[PDB]
Amino acid sequence: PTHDVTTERSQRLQLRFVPVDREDTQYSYKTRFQLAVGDNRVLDMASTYFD
């Protein structure tokens, strides 16, 4: 298909989100991420692995 399939308005394929804030206690390592889902683009969390 040629039309109404792909964006072609200069958007990314992968996004790397640095944690907004994080704490490293002796037991664990908790990080908070603020992922923003564009304005029209949509994802499924089969992706979004933690690095």
Binding site: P1, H3, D4, V5
Partner: peptide, 24 residues
């Protein structure tokens, strides 16, 4: 939305639920 599907040619080519749950 048939135009969105990949076309086999002149005619576009064309299982919407999942059933996978079991304890063994």
């Amino acid at each position: 939305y048939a135009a969105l599907a990949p076309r086999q040619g002149s005619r576009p080519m064309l299982g919407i639920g999942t059933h996978e749950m079991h304890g063994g």
